[PDB]
Amino acid sequence: TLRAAVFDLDGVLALPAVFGVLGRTEEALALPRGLLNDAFQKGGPEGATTRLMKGEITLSQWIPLMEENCRKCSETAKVCLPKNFSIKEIFDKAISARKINRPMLQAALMLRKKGFTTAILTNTWLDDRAERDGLAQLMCELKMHFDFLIESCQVGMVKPEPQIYKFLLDTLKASPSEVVFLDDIGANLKPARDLGMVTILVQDTDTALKELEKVTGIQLLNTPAPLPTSCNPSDMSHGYVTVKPRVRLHFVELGSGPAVCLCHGFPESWYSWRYQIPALAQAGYRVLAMDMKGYGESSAPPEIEEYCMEVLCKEMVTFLDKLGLSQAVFIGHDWGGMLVWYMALFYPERVRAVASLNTPFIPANPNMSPLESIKANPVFDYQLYFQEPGVAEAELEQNLSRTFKSLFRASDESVLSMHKVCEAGGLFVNSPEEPSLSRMVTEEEIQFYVQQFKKSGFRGPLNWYRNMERNWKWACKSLGRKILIPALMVTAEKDFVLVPQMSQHMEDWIPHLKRGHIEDCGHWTQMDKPTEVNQILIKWLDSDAR
Amino acid sequence: TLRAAVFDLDGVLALPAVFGVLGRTEEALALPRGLLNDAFQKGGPEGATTRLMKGEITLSQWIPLMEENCRKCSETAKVCLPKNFSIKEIFDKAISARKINRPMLQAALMLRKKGFTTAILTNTWLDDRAERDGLAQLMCELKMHFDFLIESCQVGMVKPEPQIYKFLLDTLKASPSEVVFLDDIGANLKPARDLGMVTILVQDTDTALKELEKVTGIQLLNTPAPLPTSCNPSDMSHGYVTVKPRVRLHFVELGSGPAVCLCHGFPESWYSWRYQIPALAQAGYRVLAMDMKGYGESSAPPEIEEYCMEVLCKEMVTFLDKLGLSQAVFIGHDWGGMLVWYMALFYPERVRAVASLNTPFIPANPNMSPLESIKANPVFDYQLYFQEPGVAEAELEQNLSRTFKSLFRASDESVLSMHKVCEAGGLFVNSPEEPSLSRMVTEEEIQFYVQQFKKSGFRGPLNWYRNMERNWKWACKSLGRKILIPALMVTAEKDFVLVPQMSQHMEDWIPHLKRGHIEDCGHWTQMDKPTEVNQILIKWLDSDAR
Ligand SMILES: CCCCc1nc2[nH]nc(N)c2c2c1CSC(C)(C)C2
Ligand SMILES: CCCCc1nc2[nH]nc(N)c2c2c1CSC(C)(C)C2
């Protein structure tokens, strides 16, 4: 009974295989067959290539010894190498052309999901080329999905020597019979066979995957589209910045490139962005996923005025100052989406680009009390229930598990009756005591919000809705302005409070505005449609954020 | 008696003044005098420029209303504007040409050092230009040095209206008589005068500074060269990453751009890099100043083998993995410098560039026990005193204040007799009980190391010297390799253990090696010669790190 799957890198998890480049090079240059491919394996175990694969030497030291072996090989064949034949150029292009074999990674992912221990075992080199970063990036993207990465150059052993196989088994803490082993090279596959490991010769991925599901009994081919990579909180870099004597802001940080600040809504977490964080970092961005003031590991002062937009925006500017960031692209959802529009209106020099999910930009009406405006919309009745301090806190803090289970549900799992809320006496009055688990979330993810909300509760989060007058007065100062920085508005078809039609007049104030629209998406956008959220944001970030 | 100094931005802290660009534009285009300069002040308090300065409108909304005012002004003068006259182009270039007036900032710095409250009061706009980042960067660099930044567009008030002056005084919490006020515009200076504030009309900086020192009684002109900006720990972004179940690594993070990982030596802190952190971030780098394993807020496991180079390097790779960083330039000093060379030898794909202060790269001798090699050098005797667990801990942990005061001193403040150390019975045996304060450090900075070392002590730090055999064996595997990635070796003339001549054969293993040499510099390089350390590193980073 199998419990481990092992994959080769070249020709297995990564395609096209770098090896197959000496063959294509011979064919393109009209050189004798296997001329380059054997100058490559010149001297077998004592040759330049074996020393490279054991980590005796680096790739840069290796380039000229391979060139030498290419000279000698041409001599014997009686042929001549071009004019500006370059081993370095051949290898740079081949390493650069090699991409992840996505269906192979998906199968490894699925096996690890179904309890398997997964590992990459590869014959590789110590890359010191000026362009080594491209490969380093690929190895970082691949490795995160596996329990182990065994590189020949780092262990001083090499396939097909049998000690690397015994090394592999020892690191797996398993007998050869509990192990599937995939390799595109028959000779490297043989010692694993000889030990009794289940082996697959990988030519085409499809056939290799049919063999893999046959042997594991796990469906890997024709599988439904998987969810994007999520975040495990204990594996993240956690950041803390004091913005004022009593306020510290917590954030999760991943990737390099332009700073992208993620601003969650009510009553959320940095964790509401779990499906966006690895995707945005992978797309070449430095992700800063905030725990907004009043939430998680961020400070939660009791005062109502501490949560008015003016102070929240000012603390976000200090946050950038303290981090030494002249700018960040601000991406908000719900209350975060509202903050994000104000950051663009009051601090455009600090915002590279602005994006909102569900929350539209609507200028304040100077001829109407914000309380009158909230009363004019029946779906906004919950906002009035939130006004009186302690009331919503008592209902929301009574059973945290029930709270998040009742809130965090897709548009087809409706448990709430957002109508006549203060009259009904609360949000969960017609709601079950033990709500079923939504398909959007696991029980584990619910317990994370439960644990996060145990520190400060709902007072600070609810205080975000308790500054309607202060926010209105402050917003009225921006009524002559327009948003002329790059901006994205993403609507969710099934958000029944922040309806897509609420965003219809936005180009009157944001003429260069770009849009996104998600169908069959409720209020909890990020976890409802993670795949399309990422697709819309990455595409917008690459076109308008730089 | 003065206690506050207030500075205008344009023409005072920043030069050349943006205003003086309409004048230069008229002169270059042979247009009638003050034609542009008055199209600029068209409508006075009710005009387009006043609305811009109050934050009623943004700079992008303003561009076309100024162009209009330029049309009307030409009409009356009977002249014609060029062909492709551009207000946007004129302003982009002028904002971009404007740099910090360094002597003015130095005087503000000195005044704040001598107990003054400093502030910037400026008539500015809400910048939403595609190129707004350049100015945002300048404002971030300037503002950090002041107690307050009062921007007209953010307060809705404007100079010369007297409410901004009363606003300024209220924010300062001081009477007009305790305030110096510098402005290049006589009309903006007048209401401050009228209130009884001490005022300076700033034409040339030199005359303005002579007036400023006359009025404050503080020397600001012909002052010795100041030290670089340091770090206040409570104002930094603090980062935490779990690299393995029991090891978490702490780091300080500042700036944006390519990742630069700073690796301190023995017995130091992330804080040993205090003078480099703001400078490197200012030079366009994302600084990650580590608390190395066994130090400060990082985990300090008791085990000796937890501090061998192999594991320390492996944890640094995991650190990059968890942060989503494919690479970082690694800059080390002392033990950090040693780690930095090994990261380059074992993980060149993860190191953008490698730099060491004082610590040379010397290949391991396979024909000699590392203990025999340490014995061959009399100055390395302290390393043998460090071998026996508990001994050096007892002496180093007895009085922390005495420890750091005795260690952290320049080459001309010698208190230690590094000779026959285990024979003498310790490091501080001939050292005073109450050492004088070195000129390199303040008492406050000493108390920071004292507080940091109270958590874990010297066991983990000393364990770095207790893996000589393990490190040697591991290093012997890299003997066939060469360092072919960009590298910098910085020698300190007066380091009497890590002598400059120890680095003499480095090009045999690092052929493309670049060098730096600091004269009159002891072992504590970063705090001994901060100005030249920064100059050497920035220049090397810009030429070789990208
Ligand atoms: C039918 C269930 C829809 C859920 C839903 N939609 C929304 N859209 N915009 C909103 N602020 C909002 C909210 C909820 C849940 S109650 C609360 C979290 C307070 C806000
Ligand atoms: C004369 C005082 C010189 C100070 C000095 N120089 C050095 N150079 N290289 C070194 N590891 C080192 C050390 C010291 C102080 S003792 C200790 C911190 C253990 C190491």
Side-chain angles (χ1 to χ4, degrees), chain A residues 266-267 382 385-386 391-409 415-418 420-422 424-435 458 524:
Chain A
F266 179 91
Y382 78 92
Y385 167 62
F386 284 1
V391 187
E393 282 93 328
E395 183 183 38
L396 302 167
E397 285 160 31
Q398 191 235 89
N399 182 2
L400 295 177
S401 209
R402 166 178 199 236
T403 285
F404 300 104
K405 266 161 173 189
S406 308
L407 293 170
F408 303 165
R409 14 185 85 246
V415 132
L416 303 175
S417 11
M418 233 71 136
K420 317 203 216 195
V421 165
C422 351
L427 260 309
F428 313 132
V429 283
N430 280 323
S431 166
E433 262 300 315
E434 292 198 296
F458 284 85
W524 315 100

Side-chain angles (χ1 to χ4, degrees), chain A residues 266-267 334 382-383 386 407 414 416 418 427 465 495-498 523-524:
Chain A
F266 179 91
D334 185 71
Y382 78 92
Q383 307 209 340
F386 284 1
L407 293 170
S414 358
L416 303 175
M418 233 71 136
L427 260 309
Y465 285 98
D495 190 325
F496 304 126
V497 169
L498 308 165
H523 176 72
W524 315 100

Side-chain angles (χ1 to χ4, degrees), chain A residues 22-24 26-28 30-38 73 77 79:
Chain A
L22 301 136
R24 251 155 313 150
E26 287 147 3
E27 275 225 359
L31 289 156
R33 301 217 170 282
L35 196 270
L36 291 198
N37 244 311
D38 71 34
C73 276
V79 308

Side-chain angles (χ1 to χ4, degrees), chain A residues 300-321:
Chain A
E303 302 86 14
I304 284 170
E305 338 87 64
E306 274 290 278
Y307 302 85
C308 70
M309 281 287 121
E310 184 176 18
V311 345
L312 293 169
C313 285
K314 213 273 142 284
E315 289 167 350
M316 282 312 295
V317 169
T318 306
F319 174 81
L320 292 186
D321 296 328

Side-chain angles (χ1 to χ4, degrees), chain B residues 266-267 334 382 386 407 416 418 427 465 495 497-498 523-524:
Chain B
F266 179 91
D334 185 71
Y382 78 92
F386 284 1
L407 293 170
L416 303 175
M418 233 71 136
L427 260 309
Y465 285 98
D495 190 325
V497 169
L498 308 165
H523 176 72
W524 315 100

Side-chain angles (χ1 to χ4, degrees), chain B residues 31-36 38-39 42 66-82 85:
Chain B
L31 289 156
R33 301 217 170 282
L35 196 271
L36 291 198
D38 71 34
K42 198 128 207 286
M66 161 59 43
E67 304 206 275
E68 175 51 5
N69 287 353
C70 280
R71 156 248 136 135
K72 280 169 277 183
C73 276
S74 77
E75 211 156 23
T76 325
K78 270 165 155 150
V79 308
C80 289
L81 298 147
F85 171 75

Side-chain angles (χ1 to χ4, degrees), chain B residues 487-508:
Chain B
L488 180 73
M489 177 68 214
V490 191
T491 53
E493 178 191 18
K494 282 131 173 192
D495 190 325
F496 304 126
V497 169
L498 308 165
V499 310
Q501 49 133 35
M502 268 180 70
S503 87
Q504 77 184 315
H505 307 306
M506 282 175 68
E507 16 281 303
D508 296 342

